[PDB]
Amino acid sequence: DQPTQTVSYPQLIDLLRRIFVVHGTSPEVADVLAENCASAQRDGSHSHGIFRIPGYLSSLASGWVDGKAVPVVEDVGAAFVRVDACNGFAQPALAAARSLLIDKARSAGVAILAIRGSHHFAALWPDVEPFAEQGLVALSMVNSMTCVVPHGARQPLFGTNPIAFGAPRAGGEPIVFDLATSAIAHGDVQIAAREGRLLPAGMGVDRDGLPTQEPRAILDGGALLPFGGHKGSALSMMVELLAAGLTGGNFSFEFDWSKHPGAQTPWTGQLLIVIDPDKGAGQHFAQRSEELVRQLHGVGQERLPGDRRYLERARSMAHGIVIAQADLERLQELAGH
Amino acid sequence: TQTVSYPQLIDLLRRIFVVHGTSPEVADVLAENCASAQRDGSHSHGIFRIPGYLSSLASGWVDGKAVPVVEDVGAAFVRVDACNGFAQPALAAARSLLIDKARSAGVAILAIRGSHHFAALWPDVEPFAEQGLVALSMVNSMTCVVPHGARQPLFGTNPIAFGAPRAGGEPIVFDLATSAIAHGDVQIAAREGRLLPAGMGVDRDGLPTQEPRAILDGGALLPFGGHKGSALSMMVELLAAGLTGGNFSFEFDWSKHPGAQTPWTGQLLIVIDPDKGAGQHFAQRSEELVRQLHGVGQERLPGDRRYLERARSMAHGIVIAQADLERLQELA
Numbered sequence: 120d121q122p123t124q125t126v127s128y129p130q131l132i133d134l135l136r137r138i139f140v141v142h143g144t145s146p147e148v149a150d151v152l153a154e155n156c157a158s159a160q161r162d163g164s165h166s167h168g169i170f171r172i173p174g175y176l177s178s179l180a181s182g183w184v185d186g187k188a189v190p191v192v193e194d195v196g197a198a199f200v201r202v203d204a205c206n207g208f209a210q211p212a213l214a215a216a217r218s219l220l221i222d223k224a225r226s227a228g229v230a231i232l233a234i235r236g237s238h239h240f241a242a243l244w245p246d247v248e249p250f251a252e253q254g255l256v257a258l259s260m261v262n263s264m265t266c267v268v269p270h271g272a273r274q275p276l277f278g279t280n281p282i283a284f285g286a287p288r289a290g291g292e293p294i295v296f297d298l299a300t301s302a303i304a305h306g307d308v309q310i311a312a313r314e315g316r317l318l319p320a321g322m323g324v325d326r327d328g329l330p331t332q333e334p335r336a337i338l339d340g341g342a343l344l345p346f347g348g349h350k351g352s353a354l355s356m357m358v359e360l361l362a363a364g365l366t367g368g369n370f371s372f373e374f375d376w377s378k379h380p381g382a383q384t385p386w387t388g389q390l391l392i393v394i395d396p397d398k399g400a401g402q403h404f405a406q407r408s409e410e411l412v413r414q415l416h417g418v419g420q421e422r423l424p425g426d427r428r429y430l431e432r433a434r435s436m437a438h439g440i441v442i443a444q445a446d447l448e449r450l451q452e453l454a455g456h
Numbered sequence: 457t458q459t460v461s462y463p464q465l466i467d468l469l470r471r472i473f474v475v476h477g478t479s480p481e482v483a484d485v486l487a488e489n490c491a492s493a494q495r496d497g498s499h500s501h502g503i504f505r506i507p508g509y510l511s512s513l514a515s516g517w518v519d520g521k522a523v524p525v526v527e528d529v530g531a532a533f534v535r536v537d538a539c540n541g542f543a544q545p546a547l548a549a550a551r552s553l554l555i556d557k558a559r560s561a562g563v564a565i566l567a568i569r570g571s572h573h574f575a576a577l578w579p580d581v582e583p584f585a586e587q588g589l590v591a592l593s594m595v596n597s598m599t600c601v602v603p604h605g606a607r608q609p610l611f612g613t614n615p616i617a618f619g620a621p622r623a624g625g626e627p628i629v630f631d632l633a634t635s636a637i638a639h640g641d642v643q644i645a646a647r648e649g650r651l652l653p654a655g656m657g658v659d660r661d662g663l664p665t666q667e668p669r670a671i672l673d674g675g676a677l678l679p680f681g682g683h684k685g686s687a688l689s690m691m692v693e694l695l696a697a698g699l700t701g702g703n704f705s706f707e708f709d710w711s712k713h714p715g716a717q718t719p720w721t722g723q724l725l726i727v728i729d730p731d732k733g734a735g736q737h738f739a740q741r742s743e744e745l746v747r748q749l750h751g752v753g754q755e756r757l758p759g760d761r762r763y764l765e766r767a768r769s770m771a772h773g774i775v776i777a778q779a780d781l782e783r784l785q786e787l788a
């Protein structure tokens with residue numbers, strides 16, 4: 120068995136920041152991605168934690184993604200902001216337009232951020248959480264690379280296309296959910312393939328369209344199924360239309376990295392809608408949401424969306440972030456240690 | 457089965473509403489909405505709902521003469537107090553202002569509170585897409601859905617609708633309840649003595665059941681897609697009620713109003729100009745997605761079934777059982 124070790128949250132952030140800088144990103148990009156990736160690891164979002172470092176680096180090395188891209192923030196309407204990520208990562212683009220977006224949301228009541236030409240290789244909750252912490256409601260969508268078969272279709276077309284939502288609550292941490300519209304997140308398949316284990320059944324099919332539990336069968340010519348059936352498929356179509364169609368970014372099937380050995384980041388876009396829930400209101404949203412939480416506990420829902428992550432976050436801050444010795448060593452070597 | 461034209465059905469339903477106490481304005485809105493559903497083949501939200509509309513109005517549970525109060529509260533934010541009336545009249549009252557804001561600011565929100573919605577949601581978003589705008593709407597209903605992992609129902613069937621324009625056809629539109637099945641369909645299965653597939657609901661003891669009667673007899677429904685659909689349902693409560701100021705699905709009941717059938721909640725609508733400051737045409741992008749979907753084998757796109765039925769209705773009229781027509785005429 121693999122012996123484990125622990126690293127503090129700030130230590131992990133510094134380690135990842137060094138890795139990104141050494142491998143070609145600007146310091147701003149390194150700061151953003153390091154905190155993001157470390158935060159995912161801290162919260163137990165394993166698929167989008169340090170597991171993504173190799174993919175980040177091979178994508179950078181191949182020239183597929185520009186780690187030093189400077190986002191172009193476009194103020195196109197009283198409540199509309201677009202950002203040309205310029206073939207760089209999505210997070211730095213969001214960070215560049217965040218203050219403007221918030222000003223518009225508070226002033227106009229709601230504001231949209233449409234990121235195009237961006238690479239998103241992480242969880243989505245980190246993108247909406249900060250807005251909720253500031254008393255704002257946020258909804259976001261991002262499309263990936265093709266891997267999901269539309270309901271009733273014979274071949275894959277949609278990406279794993281996640282949707283995230285964040286909202287404030289008067290008595291605690293923001294209510295936040297982040298879910299892939301595919302039965303299981305594509306990242307889950309990669310993890311299973313890595314760990315050499317099988318997946319639960321009814322989540323994907325092989326190259327021949329037959330049911331399978333082998334991650335390799337799904338990754339090699341196969342595909343994932345939309346969650347819940349036709350409804351999840353409709354929501355996945357919505358993500359393509361909103362994260363790409365509306366933003367100007369590529370749909371999940373509109374990019375090819377075959378010419379860039381090592382490329383793994385989807386080159387698409389991201390949509391974010393931020394709302395001041397109390398704009399012109401005669402009540403307080405945060406009070407209403409707290410009541411909903413109370414009623415949820417009342418009917419027996421002990422675990423609300425986000426609770427699991429907050430628990431892992433608490434554990435990580437108390438006992439440190441658990442990491443395989445071999446993985447920590449690899450990260451240290453990549454940082455130059 | 458007699459055949460009536462779309463405009464004839466509207467006129468007939470409008471008379472029924474006016475005869476039963478609604479204002480002429482509300483009658484026009486509801487008549488067109490209900491007739492439109494019948495026209496598209498959405499029988500669950502067509503004339504089948506008339507009895508429920510009338511029973512709800514009879515007790516005063518819903519105010520058929522309510523006058524929506526539009527509140528312009530932000531460059532991109534509009535609120536409307538439905539004043540215990542139906543949701544559609546409230547939306548119609550603020551629609552022009554909402555569109556002006558969406559086109560100017562780029563996006564705009566309409567938060568309706570104190571409204572009764574007894575219809576499908578696609579009629580609410582489709583018009584915006586017909587005008588080149590993208591629209592997303594959420595409405596919370598009445599307690600009957602058990603949150604994932606919970607022991608008792610709390611959320612309503614809470615539907616979500618989406619509408620977007622496409623360059624080569626009618627709007628791409630989807631409208632879905634976040635519950636595994638719509639309540640109306642549980643009633644139908646009960647009447648037809650049909651069992652439901654596994655996972656739609658539970659009995660009064662919280663045990664899984666396929667018997668629609670067991671679900672209706674103190675039972676409850678389950679969210680679609682397990683924990684994921686449940687999270688979306690929670691979002692609907694928060695957006696259609698928490699944000700609007702209307703009641704959550706569990707903050708009202710029909711105990712004091714015999715015959716009440718409508719939830720008294722709210723509705724959220726987000727309308728976006730997809731091309732605001734864009735160096736492309738959204739309608740061309742969506743059309744390409746449609747082409748690609750056809751390319752991978754998806755023959756049916758959300759809305760296609762209704763558009764096909766709609767064409768038939770406009771070309772051959774709306775076919776209705778003589779029995780139903782007679783009673784509608786009597787109600788009129």
Ligand SMILES: NC(=O)C1=CN([C@@H]2O[C@@H](COP(=O)(O)OP(=O)(O)OC[C@H]3O[C@@H](n4cnc5c(N)ncnc54)[C@H](OP(=O)(O)O)[C@@H]3O)[C@@H](O)[C@H]2O)C=CC1
Pocket residue numbers: 164166167239240241242243244261262263279280281282283295296297298299300303304305306307385422423424425426427428429604605683684687
């Ligand atoms: N291109 C990209 O960047 C992509 C990123 N992803 C990311 O990968 C992801 C993991 O997604 P997916 O696998 O769908 O996640 P899940 O299926 O775990 O979780 C969906 C979510 O469901 C809530 N939840 C899970 N189990 C329960 C339960 N039993 N009761 C109540 N709520 C519950 C979660 O809370 P909680 O977290 O606290 O457990 C969370 O909000 C996301 O973070 C997503 O953003 C996916 C596809 C593409």
Ligand SMILES: NC(=O)C1=CN([C@@H]2O[C@@H](COP(=O)(O)OP(=O)(O)OC[C@H]3O[C@@H](n4cnc5c(N)ncnc54)[C@H](OP(=O)(O)O)[C@@H]3O)[C@@H](O)[C@H]2O)C=CC1
Pocket residue numbers: 270271349350353573574575576577578595596597598613614615616629630631632633634637638639719756757758759760761762
């Ligand atoms: N309080 C209220 O007012 C409430 C209203 N409702 C309403 O009742 C409803 C019916 O909803 P629900 O039962 O969820 O509907 P379904 O489960 O039938 O349909 C969900 C939708 O799925 C699309 N769809 C269905 N089958 C396929 C397929 N094979 N391939 C591709 N797309 C497909 C539909 O297109 P399409 O339309 O063409 O069939 C539509 O957008 C809605 O209209 C809803 O608004 C529900 C709860 C509460």
